[PDB]
Structures are given as C-alpha cells and as structure tokens.
C-alpha cells in the first residue's frame, strides 16, 4: 500500500495552526456544498432528554 503511492508532488496554499509542535491544516468545506442538494455532514442535529 505504501509503495503504490504517487511519485510526483505539487504545491498549493492553505492555512495552518500551531498546536504544540504539531501543525495541522484548517479547512471548511463550504465551497463544495454551496448550491447542491446534499446537506453538509458537519452540520448536524443533536438532541437531549
């Protein structure tokens, strides 16, 4: 599985936050769901009793 990976790589821009020597990427997927008929699965309902 690891040896099947791609050999070429390309640069692209994104936002990053520092979390104690761990660096992670911040992204919102608003653009993919903008005018579609499907609901964003990160917008959810939760209920309490």
């Amino acid at each position: 599985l690891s040896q099947a990976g791609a050999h070429s790589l390309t640069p692209l821009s994104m936002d990053v936050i520092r979390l104690g020597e761990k660096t992670v990427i911040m992204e919102n997927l608003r653009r993919v769901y903008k005018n579609t008929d499907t609901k964003d699965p990160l917008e959810r309902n939760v209920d309490l009793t």
């Binding site: 608003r30 579609t36 008929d37 609901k39 964003d40 917008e43």
Partner: protein, 49 residues
C-alpha cells in the same frame, strides 16, 4: 446569513419559525446600538458583521 446554509429549497414550517424567532430577537436587541452600548469590541464586531 445565519440561516443561509440549511435551507436548500423553499422554506418549510420549522425553518420559517426559526427565521421569525431570530428576526424578533435581533430586532429587539440591536434597535438603538450606540445608545445601548459603547464598548469597542462589540461595535467593531457589529460593523464587521
């Protein structure tokens, strides 16, 4: 702008009710802004919004 992301066709009953409640609450809260409050962060946030 708060409810823009959930409705993806003509509004149903519950979405209309939520919009109405937001209308009433915000209209009551922000009627006379500069007489109501004078703190810096709130005014900057309001203008940004």
């Amino acid at each position: 702008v708060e409810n823009a992301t959930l409705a993806r066709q003509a509004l149903n009953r519950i979405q209309r009710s939520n919009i109405l409640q937001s209308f009433k609450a915000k209209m009551l809260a922000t009627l006379f802004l500069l007489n109501r409050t004078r703190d810096r962060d709130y005014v900057l946030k309001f203008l940004t919004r």
